[PDB]
Amino acid sequence: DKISHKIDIPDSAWTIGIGEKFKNAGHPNVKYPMIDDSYVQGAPLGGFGAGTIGRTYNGGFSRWHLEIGKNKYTTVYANQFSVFQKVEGNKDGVAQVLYAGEPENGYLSSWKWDYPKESGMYYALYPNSWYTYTNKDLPVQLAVKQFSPIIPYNYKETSYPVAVFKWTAYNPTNKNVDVSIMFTWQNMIGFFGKQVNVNSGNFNKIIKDKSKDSEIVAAVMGNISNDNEEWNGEYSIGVKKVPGVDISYKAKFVTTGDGSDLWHEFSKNGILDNKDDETPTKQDGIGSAIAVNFKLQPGQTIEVPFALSWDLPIMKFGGGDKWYKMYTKYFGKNGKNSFAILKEALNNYQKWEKMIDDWQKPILSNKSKPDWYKTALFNELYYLADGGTAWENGKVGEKRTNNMFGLLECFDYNYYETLDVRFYGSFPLVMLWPDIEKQVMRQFADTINVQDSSEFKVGSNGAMAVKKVQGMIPHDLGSSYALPWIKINAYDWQNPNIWKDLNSKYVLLVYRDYVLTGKTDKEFLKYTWKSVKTALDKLKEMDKDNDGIPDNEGIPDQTYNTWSMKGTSAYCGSLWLAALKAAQEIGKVLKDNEAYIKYNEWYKIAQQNFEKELWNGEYYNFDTESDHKDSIMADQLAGQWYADILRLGDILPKDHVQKALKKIYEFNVMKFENGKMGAVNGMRPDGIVDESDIQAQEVWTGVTYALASFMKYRGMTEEAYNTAYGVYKMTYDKSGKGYWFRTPEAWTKDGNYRASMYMRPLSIWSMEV
Ligand SMILES: OC[C@H]1O[C@@H](O[C@@H]2[C@@H](O)[C@H](O)O[C@H](CO)[C@H]2O)[C@H](O)[C@@H](O)[C@@H]1O
Ligand SMILES: [Ca+2]
What atom of ligand 1 comes closest to residue 475's alpha carbon? Predict the structure, then answer.
């Protein structure tokens, strides 16, 4: 490996061998069908709300999130980079697809597949990823840096449906070598959203944009139809000329054939036919190819950028609504703008690299923090783009000031912005994209007093329940299968209108969002204040026994939705205390004296009784009325965790909080698989995992990272990082279960998982508060 020195990969990048087989991979531990796309994954490409594309460590474009809210794992084999090399003096060169695999049928059989093992590495530090190619049959060593411009405090480039591939080629040998790099792409119009005639009308055109010191050559792969529909738009691939390279192209090769129309050209001398051909296809799949060829002398390095864009302006949800995607603000809505997007990237990618470096540098340069922590901190952010992210710029046929946003809970449980989850998972948004975060919370504010008295069948018990109760915060803002933003509470497995954590978590999120954006946004507090008061006032009505605290009902009625709480719980109780303290402080800021007094009175009563009911001398009991009420819950003081972040002070005595956190580390972490797998949710006081429900026996990745942040704030530095380390290890390490770029909600002691690609572990960003 002589190429690594010619590029700049951070030491904290996650690494794996190209073509590496992973032997320890976990699988779902549930009885019901659940997504398992295996461990062949990579960091995604694409902006927020753009649709994303997962290019895996083996090189394939395989995890398709272009249909917003859907996960489709299938390798489109025509989409590749390939290389040709010929040593000066030799009669023949070699050509190789840079993909560690081969197609499953006979399409593209002429191409040279099966990039060999032990011949290159993949690296990722989101939003960047890299491949290096160090192959005994390729004398010139190559590397590529690929990324999209995901940039904190930037709502423009961060939305773009674009990727850059910055190639570096170096000749360490003593002979001249001719080298070509070729990007192939299938015209994927009709891959989704089209009910018949999936390739019909697809056609490819070549754009040559020549100006002074700028030559771009690109293929635009579109359809003859000018219809404005979810399926229609354009893909583009292209390259920018640099000194010492020549560009060649082929407009049209058949992807549903053996590929020799292209490969007989590329494999001879790495130079394509430059054949334009705008003939639309009928049934055949078609694709385009863009190549560069250059001669490298001994010791010479060359850099050359390629790009990919996709202009698919319309997202459609299963309930029928069609929306424009956010990036259309910057490029237009007609779906004929892929070249403009590509050109912007090829002319500005160096600026974008610097902008990414500028935001990663404060963390990467901090030599007090271990590299593993940096690996997880940046790579968990993959989910912000890869979580079915929807970001609208108008309803089709509709202008408003704001752009509504939603991130999925996950794909298995297809609900936008699930609030009990976003309490943990929204840290990156408030910290890095706060205008999105505040927009989401206004979306929730607007739902508080919505009443939908139409009844739905509850999945878990078959009862009928009201869809949405006035004054109760919704579980979610809809499903991609139905109507995001319009029809809330798509979750129907249980009735969220009786949950005891949603209304408190809502208030805590509101005040968090004020505090972590500098305590200056009084307008945001004003917008949300009525909803805050309503939410707490409704929750107060659920106090059955007048101890000042809402009663859990002995059926799951909170985020641990199979782990029943009854009476006063540490979890819902502490969240309630913190929410009351938050509302007092908002009352003070907004000069609402009567609200301040009321919530102060409720707080003092509830605080006294919480302590009396639950403090046992070592930790806070799980609850007051359950069969294993004395279980040690990892998340028992979630309200105090948030109170620390919100600078609300002590809701419980410092001594008791410290004792409780030490007990959780000693038991839920260190007595669970030697503290190498995170914090198990429930442990009995005898040091045996609580078996009352599956959730008690799970580690929740997002709960564990949040607990680590709580420990860190409380000065338990070693315990914090040791607790988080087990989550990192399981997700990323060779000794773990292969969950990189699909971090799950949960695992059990055997390492098997529930709900890959989950929002909650974005809570790792609470460790950066
Ligand atoms: O892991 C806890 C989270 O569980 C989620 O519930 C899932 C449902 O959404 C899905 O429809 O069904 C499965 C199987 O019954 C549930 O696990 C909730 O959406 C989250 O609120 C909850 O925290
Ligand atoms: Ca009560």
Answer: 21
